[PDB]
Amino acid sequence: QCVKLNDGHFMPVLGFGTYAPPEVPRSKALEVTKLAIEAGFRHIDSAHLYNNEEQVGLAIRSKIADGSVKREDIFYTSKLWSTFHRPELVRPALENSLKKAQLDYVDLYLIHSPMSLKPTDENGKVIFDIVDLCTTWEAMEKCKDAGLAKSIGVSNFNRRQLEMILNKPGLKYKPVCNQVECHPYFNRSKLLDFCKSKDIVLVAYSALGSQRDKRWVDPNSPVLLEDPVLCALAKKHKRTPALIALRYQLQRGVVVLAKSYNEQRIRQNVQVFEFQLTAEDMKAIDGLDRNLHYFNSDSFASHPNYPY
Ligand SMILES: NC(=O)c1ccc[n+]([C@@H]2O[C@H](COP(=O)([O-])OP(=O)(O)OC[C@H]3O[C@@H](n4cnc5c(N)ncnc54)[C@H](OP(=O)(O)O)[C@@H]3O)[C@@H](O)[C@H]2O)c1
Ligand SMILES: COc1ccc2c(c1)c(CC(=O)O)c(C)n2C(=O)c1ccc(Cl)cc1
Numbered sequence: 001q002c003v004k005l006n007d008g009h010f011m012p013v014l015g016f017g018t019y020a021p022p023e024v025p026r027s028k029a030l031e032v033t034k035l036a037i038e039a040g041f042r043h044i045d046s047a048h049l050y051n052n053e054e055q056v057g058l059a060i061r062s063k064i065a066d067g068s069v070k071r072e073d074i075f076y077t078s079k080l081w082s083t084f085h086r087p088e089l090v091r092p093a094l095e096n097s098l099k100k101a102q103l104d105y106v107d108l109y110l111i112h113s114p115m116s117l118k119p120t121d122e123n124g125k126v127i128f129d130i131v132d133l134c135t136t137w138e139a140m141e142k143c144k145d146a147g148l149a150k151s152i153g154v155s156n157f158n159r160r161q162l163e164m165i166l167n168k169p170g171l172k173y174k175p176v177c178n179q180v181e182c183h184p185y186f187n188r189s190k191l192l193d194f195c196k197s198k199d200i201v202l203v204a205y206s207a208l209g210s211q212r213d214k215r216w217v218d219p220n221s222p223v224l225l226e227d228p229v230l231c232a233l234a235k236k237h238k239r240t241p242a243l244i245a246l247r248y249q250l251q252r253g254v255v256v257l258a259k260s261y262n263e264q265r266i267r268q269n270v271q272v273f274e275f276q277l278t279a280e281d282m283k284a285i286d287g288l289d290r291n292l293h294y295f296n297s298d299s300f301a302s303h304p305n306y307p308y
Contacts, residue, residue, distance in 0.1 A: 001042075001273075003255060005176035006199040007144075009107065009151045012075055013250060014272060015043035017205065017259030019050045021213065024261065026055055032261045033059035037069060040270045045179075045205075045257050047079035047112055048097055057101030076103065079112035079155060080140070083119050085131040090139035094148050109149035110179060111136060113156040115303040128303050133161070134168045141172045153177040155203075158307040159194050166198060179203035181210075182254060183224055183245060184285050185292040192254060203255045208242050210294040211259070217294045229284050237275055246272040248285045 002010040016036040018029055029052040033044060037059065046056045060076060063069050078101070084093040094109055116129040140152045153175040154162065162178060165171070178195055182188045182204035195202045209224025210217060224230070230241040237244065242258070246269060249256035258269045277285070293308055300306055 003201060003253075005151055005201060006174055007151050007176055009176070010075075011108070011151075011177070011201060011255060012041075012043040013255045014041065014246070014270070015045050015075075015077070015203070015255065015257040016041040016266075017257040018044060018046045018052055018056050019211070019259060020052070020261055021211065022051075026052065028261055029055035030059050030062075032263075032266065034063060035263050035266050037063045037074075039267045041266075042069070042073055043075040043077070043255075045077045046101075047110075048081045048084075048093065049079070049112060053078060053097055053100035057103060061102060071103075075107040076101070077108040077110065078106050079110040080136075082113050082115055082117040083129075085111070085116040085129065085133065085136045086119060087135045087139035089119065090136060091143055091146070091148065094143050098148065105147060106149050108151045108153060108176070109140065109143060110153045110155045110177075111140065111157075114154070114158075114161050114305045114307055115156075115300060116305065120299065124299055125302055126299055128305070130304070134164060137165050137168065144173055151176045153179070153200075155179040156181075156307055159191060161305070161307060162194070162198075162200070174198070175200055177201040177203050177255070179205055179257075181206050181293050181295060182249065183207050183209055184227065184230065184248060184288040185209075185222070185224060185290050186294075187252075187286065187289045189286075189289070192252065196253065201255055202253075203257065204249050205257050206294055207249055207256045208245055208258060212294065215299075216297045218296060221292060221294055221296075227288060229288055233277070233281055233284065236281075237277075239271065239275060240268065242269065243271055243275070244277070244285070247275065247277050248282065251277055251282060
C-alpha cells in the first residue's frame with residue numbers, strides 16, 4: 001500500500017485531498033478528515049494556502065487520541081507557500097504549519113509551486129519575486145536535518161526546474177516527489193518518465209478533474225468525470241468514473257490524491273484497491289490526453305517561472 005521514497009521513508013499510494021473552497025465552513029475539514037481516516041486513508045495532503053491545518057491537525061490528533069491510529073501510521077504533508085521562498089522564511093513557515101496542526105513533524109514538506117511571490121498588480125497578474133530556488137531548497141534540507149519534516153519534495157515543477165535542484169552543487173537530499181496536476185486529460189507521461197528515471201515519485205492532484213474553481217478554471221473545459229471513455233470503463237467494471245481515474249494512476253506508478261467532502265464518496269474512493277484495469281483499458285485512458293491543465297489563468301501564466 002506504500003512506495004519507498006528515495007530517502008528511505010514510505011508514502012501510502014492513496015492520499016486524501018483536504019482543500020475546500022473559502023465558502024465551505026472551516027469546521028467541515030475536521031469532520032471529513034476524521035471520516036477519511038475512518039474509511040482507511042492514511043496519507044493526508046494539506047498546505048498553508050488551504051487555511052485548514054488547524055482543523056486537519058485536530059482530526060489527526062482526535063483519531064490518535066481515540067486509538068484508531070498512531071502518529072507513525074499517518075503520513076501528513078504540508079507545503080511552503082510562494083511568498084516564503086526566501087530561504088530565511090522557510091523554517092519559520094514550517095514551524096507555523098506545525099504549530100497550526102499541533103504536530104511535532106510533518107512527514108512531507110513541499111515547495112508548493114516554483115512561482116515565487118513577493119514576501120497582485122493593477123493588471124491582476126501576481127507580483128512575482130525572483131528567488132533562486134536552489135537557495136530555497138537548501139533551507140528545506142535544513143528543515144529535514146532538524147527533524148521538522150521527515151521528507152522534502154516539490155510541487156508544480158517542470159523537468160528543467162527539477163533538474164536545477166538535482167544538479168545543485170552540494171545537494172544533500174533529492175526531492176522525494178513532484179506533486180503535479182495529473183489526470184487523463186493531462187497525464188504528464190514525459191514528466192512521469194523523467195521522475196521515474198531519477199527515483200522521484202510523481203504525485204497526482206486534480207486526479208478527478210479538479211474542483212473547477214472559477215478563479216482559475218475555464219467553465220468551458222470538458223468535465224473529466226463526464227468523459228464517455230471513463231463512463232464506459234466504469235460501467236464495464238461496475239465501478240464509477242472517479243474510481244477508474246484513480247486506478248489509472250496507480251497502475252502507472254503514480255501516487256494519487258482524491259479530495260471529497262462527502263461521506264459516501266470518501267468511502268467509495270478507497271475501493272480503488274479492489275479492482276484492476278486491463279492493458280486495453282489503460283490504452284483507452286491514455287488516448288484521452290489533450291494537454292488540458294485546468295489551472296489556466298492570466299493571473300499566473302505570465303509569471304517568469306510558470307511551469308507549463
Ligand atoms: N500542489 C498543488 O498545487 C495542488 C493543487 C490542487 C490540489 N492539490 C491537492 O490535491 C487535492 C485533490 O485535488 P482537487 O482538490 O483538485 O480535487 P480532485 O481530487 O480532483 O476532486 C475533484 C472533485 O471530485 C469529487 N469527487 C471525489 N470523489 C468522487 C467520487 N467518487 N465520485 C464523484 N465525484 C467525486 C469531489 O467532490 P465532493 O467533495 O463533492 O465529493 C471533488 O471536489 C486537493 O484537495 C489538494 O490536497 C494540490
Ligand atoms: C487544477 O489546478 C489547480 C492548481 C492549483 C490549485 C487548484 C487547482 C486549486 C483548487 C482545486 O484543487 O481544484 C487550488 C486551491 N490550487 C492551489 O492550491 C494552488 C497552488 C499553487 C498555486 Cl501557485 C496556485 C493555486
